[PDB]
Every structure is written in C-alpha cells, then in structure tokens.
Design a protein around this ligand. Structure first.
Ligand SMILES: OC[C@H]1O[C@H](O)[C@H](O)[C@@H]1O
Ligand SMILES: OC[C@H]1O[C@H](O)[C@H](O)[C@@H]1O
Ligand SMILES: [Ca+2]
Ligand SMILES: [Ca+2]
Lengths: 319, 318
C-alpha cells in the first residue's frame, strides 16, 4: 500500500542484528533488497548461516544473502564476541542449517551492483564491522555518490567504548575500514554507543515481549536470555541495550534524534586502536591536523528515548 | 599557619604566570621551587619568565630549576607563541632578571626535595610532564615519596585544544604523561573538560585592570594577547582559566568532584596525546591497556561560581 525505501543491511547476526532484521522485514515502508554479512559477533560463515535462517523465519527466503569478508582489511582470523552472542551468534540455540543458499557474488560486489542498478535509491544500514562497505568504496570511487544514506551503528563519541575503554566493537573489528567509510564523502549517519546505551529494554520489557502477540516473540525472547545475562555480568544492568535496533530507528525516524556535523577519524594503531573521534568544528586550529580537509559526516548527538522505545516495541510486538 | 610544601612545574606562559603570582600570595602554601619546561615557550624562555616572576612577587630567593629542552622522544618542541606571544608572556618584551637559575636540573631538583621531606612535598604540574617523568624514571622511590601530583592536562571525553584529540601539555610530551599516569603516585588530573567551563570575560578583565590588585596592571597587560587568541580561535571574548583552576583544586578540592580510574595516553598515530580514563563501571571480558594499573583521581565536575570568585579574589587582592 505505501512507498517502500530500498535498503541493504550489512550485518554480523548477532542477537540485536537478528532483532533488527526481523523488525526490518515487518516495516511496511522498507524494501530489503539484500543482507550482506560480516564477522564480529560470530565468524562470517556463522553470520551468513544466521542471515539465511532469518530470511526463512521472516517468510522471505528469496531475499539475497551475500557473504562478505572473512577477515578485516589488515588481515587475520577475527576473535568473535561469543561471550555476548553465544557460540552460534544467536544465544546458543544451535538451530538446523538453512535450505536457502547465499548468492554467488561477495557482499562488496553485491553493494556495488545494487547501488549502480538503482543510483540514489539504496540506503545501507551497517550493523557490523565496515569491511564490506570499505571494500565497495575502494573498488568503486562512484559508490559514495550513488548510495543514498549509509547509517552506521558504531563508535563511541566522547564516551567509553564497549570492547575496551577506547573502542566500540564494530569499529574495533575493522578500524581501517571504518576510517575509509568515514572519510569517503558518502552521506553517512553514525549512531554511536554514546546514544544506544541510553536506550534499554528492562527484564519487565522483555517479559512484555514474550507475553505479546509478536510474530517472532518466542524466538526473540529465547535469544535475549543469553544477551541479557551478559549485560547483567558485564554492565551490571538487568535487561539489554538496544544497539542495532536504534540505528534502524535512525533510518526510519531521524526526527527522534538530533545530529551534529563533523569530520570523523578512527585510530588504527596503539592502545586507542578503534577509537572514533569527531571534530565538531567549533575551534579554529592554528595548524592542519588529521581532521583537516575531509568532508564531515552526521553524528547522532541526542535521542528521544520514549519515542525510540515505543517504535522498537511496536515492531517487535506486531503480529 | 602551617604551610603545605609545593613545587610548581611550569612553562610560563600567561596563565602559568597568573597561577604563580596567586601561589606566592596563598598563606597555606610554601613554594619551595619553580621547575621549568617547554610548551608555551622554549625551556630557556620559561626559565627567564619564572625568574622574572620570583622577582615580581618579591621572592627572588625561590629556586628556579631549568628542566628538559625537548620531550622524551627527542626533537625541538612546537611552541605556542600564537597563544602566549614570542616571549611567552604576551609580547611585553621585559628586561631579563637579575636572579639566576640553580645548578641542578628540574628532574634532579624534584628528586632531591621529595627525598629530603618524604611524603610531604606536593607537585603542581602546569606544563608538559617531561621533568616529572624524568624524576620517576631516574628515582624508583620518587612515586611513593611525593605527597601528591596535581596535573593541569588532558581532555577527558572532550575535544582537545591542540587538535580534536589532544590537550597542549599532554601533546607536548605524550610518553612523559603516560609514565606519570601509570607511576602509582597519588595523582589528581584536571583536564580542559573542566577548565573550559571557567572563564573571565572582557568585563572581568576590565574589572581586574580597574582593581587594587597587587599585579593587576601586569596581569591585564599579559592577557591582552591571550584574550585576542581566544577571540580568533575559540570565538570567545575573554580567556579560559586553565592553570589557575588546577591551583584552585590544590587549595579548594571541595569546589570539585573527582572520579577514580586508570588513565593511559596515546603516544602514536592521529590520536597522539589523547588521554583516556577507564571509569571501571564495566567488567571487561579480557585484559586491555587499562588493566592492572593503579587508578588516579580525575576532576569530573566543578562549581564554576565558587572557582571564579576564589580566583578573582586572589587576582584583585592588594
Ligand atoms: O557494539 C555493538 C555492536 O557490535 C555488534 O555487532 C552488535 O551487534 C552491535 O552492532
Ligand atoms: O592546554 C592548556 C595548558 O597548556 C599550557 O601549558 C597552558 O599554560 C596550560 O597549562
Ligand atoms: Ca551487529
Ligand atoms: Ca601552563
């Protein structure tokens, strides 16, 4: 009935990625044109397996799943967040293998091809390390102008990281890729954990979800048991933060946030590897520095927490 | 009254000069020496200004010990002459002092005084931390014997002032700052996240010039250049009070709140000079560069009216 905006989700499912993907398949204003997978919460092969299973669970096994890079741009087999998302990446449910199969092309080929087929039409929601997006940008200098918005869940702006004091997980997963994306000149919107740690579902909210008429309520509640237990052990919070679902909310309802423009750079070496730092442009520097001359991006600054929670709950609890 | 022994390590420097003159007039403080470092001006220029400040305050007997001419990594340091003027005091070009520096380097002066009075000597660090790091490396007992080190430096979850990542003192010597912060000494750090909240407007500066303050004319004259830099760079008609706020933390810690946490400094890459604190509110799954070190105190909030009132009272005192 209503106009659908084309969206590619680049993801490492992942418990909150899974919640976001299932919400996105239910959003009537969205047309998911594909899922592109990356490592982080689980190895890339595990992320592809979960993405194919989510397409089957949502009743859309025809939605293409394109497998991305198995390692960051600097190389090396990545250590994955199995202590947060379980050994299978979805809270240790150990589900049977999907029947649907991934497409032949890589995530980077898929991103380039779709953006070239529908110029200015396709937005990218990046929910994991930015390796595939950086590969597309490096391979295609016209990608930045052809893509619509790139909404990124990543970074920690003037706030503690979540892998260590300096870095947020997605950026730490591939700092070089994040620096390439943020300096690409594309229309980028970054939602850091400085924003998403303000948006939580309590144990009571999780029980409300389990008791709801939500299409995937049972599955969402089961995955969230492991996820909630990690938040209790590590952050001392009884419930879960909503990271990937808040970035999806910034795609559909940017009016629930305020944004600041600024050049963003990523530290790629030393103790602060993975740190994201924005130059707001409020001070005139005496000399040039690593933030000089780049095109600024939009950084989520404040969030209307009740409006975001209401929107997420509505999609999760929808029959 | 009983006076707390204090060594001021400094790169004077316009706000360093304001702080030094305030410290010489504080009855609860005994300034046992000034140790100089580069930053706002080359070390030789900082020594010249420190000796001139001792003369101006009527205490030319106060020892001035010259410190390192370069940061620990070596090479000629960048000087903030665009902020503090070519002479480091706002282009006043005043005659050189009669008083002379002592023979001992700043690092050896710090070591010797701390060893003479274990647990009793405090250090107020107003510039890059090179001399303090040299004292820690040269004397393994220094960190345990110094009473407290109060540092004006860093930017905690806030923009730097040399570039988006780094505050000037830390950027001046990142390796030295990392040595000081991981030394295990009783350290208190006051970052520019705190001091950019404390300002003197053009009206406050005029009130100072028109006051009966002992050093009012000199302070106002130095601040002309300083204020012009703030107008051009920060878009603020007035000055921030950086070094005087750290001195206020020494005398009136009750005007601030502090958080404990391990602090590390980035020494390479685009974020060279960045200061980052681990608040310890999250249990990490595995060890990281903030693990295992002794935490330090980081100034977190400030009662701005109380700090401004204290600084103004000291600056305007006859
Ligand atoms: O730091 C949070 C992010 O890392 C993981 O990828 C989570 O799913 C989320 O995207
Ligand atoms: O960044 C401010 C500091 O740098 C300079 O040394 C100033 O005097 C102050 O100490
Ligand atoms: Ca994710
Ligand atoms: Ca100083």
């Amino acid at each position: 009935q209503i106009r659908r905006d084309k969206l590619i989700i680049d993801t490492d499912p992942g418990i909150d990625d899974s919640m976001t993907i299932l919400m996105a398949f239910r959003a009537p204003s969205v047309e998911i044109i594909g899922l592109t997978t990356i490592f982080g919460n689980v190895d890339t092969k595990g992320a592809t397996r979960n993405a194919l299973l989510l397409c089957e669970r949502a009743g859309c096994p025809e939605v293409p799943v394109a497998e991305g890079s198995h390692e960051p741009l600097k190389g090396g087999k990545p250590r994955v967040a199995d202590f947060v998302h379980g050994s299978d990446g979805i809270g240790n449910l150990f589900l049977p293998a999907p029947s649907a199969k991934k497409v032949e092309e890589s995530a980077a080929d898929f991103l380039i091809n779709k953006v070239s087929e529908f110029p200015g039409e396709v937005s990218v929601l990046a929910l994991g390390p930015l390796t595939n997006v950086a590969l597309a940008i490096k391979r295609d200098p016209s990608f930045a102008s052809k893509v619509k918005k790139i909404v990124v869940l990543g970074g920690a702006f003037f706030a503690a990281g979540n892998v260590n004091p300096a870095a947020e997980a997605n950026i730490h997963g591939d700092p070089e890729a994040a620096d390439i994306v943020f300096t690409s000149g594309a229309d980028i919107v970054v939602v850091g954990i400085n924003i998403t740690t303000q948006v939580c579902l309590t144990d009571e909210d999780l029980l409300e979800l389990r008791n709801s008429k939500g299409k995937h309520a049972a599955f969402l509640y089961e995955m969230c048991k492991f996820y909630r237990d990690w938040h209790a052990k590590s952050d001392g919070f009884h419930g879960i933060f909503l990271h990937d679902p808040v970035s999806f909310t910034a795609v559909l309802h940017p009016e629930y946030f305020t944004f600041k423009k600024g050049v963003v750079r990523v530290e790629t070496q030393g103790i602060c590897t993975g740190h994201t730092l924005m130059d707001q442009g409020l001070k005139k520097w005496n000399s040039e520095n690593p933030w000089s001359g780049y095109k600024p991006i939009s950084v989520a600054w404040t969030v209307d927490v009740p409006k975001v929670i209401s929107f997420i709950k509505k999609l999760l609890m929808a029959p």
